[PDB]
Structures are given as structure tokens and as C-alpha cells.
């Protein structure tokens, strides 16, 4: 196959997983020191779709509004995932408890998943792709990407 053909096939596969919201090959566990985490129940291969980071897709005005509210309730955790798309700031706000798994994945700078922006007809999605083969039984991890001094002072596990 050509590069265009393989890319076209990958896009179709990914669009369809985003539609179904199918989250196979994963389960929730408790991981010492982290809270809940998500562990693989099957081997994933490098390059595979793992899960969408699924939540409320919002723009900056609402994101800033919600941040100001969440900061007032300390039982609210940190589930807002910011990105740029078409010169604008977007956020997948996964603060609300749902059954979706992406929002439960913990942080490592040396993890096994990589977040990508995947556009379907001008709607952006954040998806996690396996950055290496992932063993059955191992925790899914990705780099949260907040390196700010203010964050790491308060959340030193961000440093690694």
C-alpha cells in the first residue's frame, strides 16, 4: 500500500473507534500512590488506538469560567485537557465522573501512550495512541504536559 492508502485506512479505523466509544482491553485498578488508574487487559501494539480522552469539548471563555469555579471546591480534581486548534484554545473538560476511561489514566513523562489531535470534519478530538507495545497487566500512562513551577511544587509527581 502507498502512504496515502495506509493513512486513509488508519483514519477510518480511528473515526470508527471514536464513534462507538468502544473501550476494550482496559480495566480500572488502584495503583499505589496514584488513586485509580487504567491497566491493559490485553497486549496493545505500538501505534494502536487506545482510548479517546473523552469529556466536554469547550472553548476558552467557558474553560476559564469553569476553572474559577473548580478552584473553589478542592474535592474536584484536575481533568481539564487544553490544546490549540485553528488558532484557538480548546479544552476537553472531563471533570464530571463518567464511565469513560481516558480521564482515569495517570501521568508519566516516560509512559506508554501519546496524545494526538484527530480532526473529524472540523471537530477536534484528543486520542491516546500506544507509543510502544503495552503489556497485559501494565498501567497505561501519558505525559500530562504541565511542567509549570506552580504545578510541580504542588504535584511533584509531575516531575517524572
Amino acid at each position: 500500500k502507498s502512504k496515502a492508502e495506509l493513512q486513509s485506512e488508519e483514519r477510518k479505523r480511528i473515526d470508527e473507534l471514536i464513534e462507538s466509544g468502544k473501550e476494550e482491553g482496559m480495566k480500572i485498578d488502584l495503583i499505589d500512590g496514584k488513586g485509580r488508574g487504567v491497566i491493559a487487559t490485553k497486549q496493545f501494539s505500538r501505534g494502536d488506538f487506545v482510548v479517546e480522552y473523552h469529556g466536554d469539548l469547550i472553548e476558552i471563555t467557558d474553560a476559564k469560567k469553569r476553572e474559577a469555579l473548580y478552584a473553589q471546591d478542592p474535592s474536584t480534581g484536575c481533568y481539564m485537557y487544553y490544546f490549540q486548534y485553528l488558532s484557538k484554545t480548546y479544552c476537553v473538560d472531563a471533570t464530571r465522573e463518567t464511565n469513560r476511561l481516558g480521564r482515569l489514566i495517570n501521568h508519566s513523562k516516560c509512559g506508554n501512550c501519546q496524545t494526538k489531535l484527530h480532526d473529524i470534519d472540523g471537530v477536534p478530538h484528543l486520542i491516546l495512541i500506544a507509543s510502544r507495545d503495552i503489556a497485559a497487566g501494565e498501567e497505561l500512562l501519558f505525559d500530562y504536559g504541565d511542567r509549570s513551577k506552580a504545578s510541580i511544587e504542588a504535584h511533584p509527581w509531575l516531575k517524572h
Partner: peptide, 8 residues
Amino acid sequence: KRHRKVLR
């Protein structure tokens, strides 16, 4: 007291 997630 809150951190974010940011795409890089």
C-alpha cells in the same frame, strides 16, 4: 493548587 493537562 491545581494542575492542567496540556497537549505537546
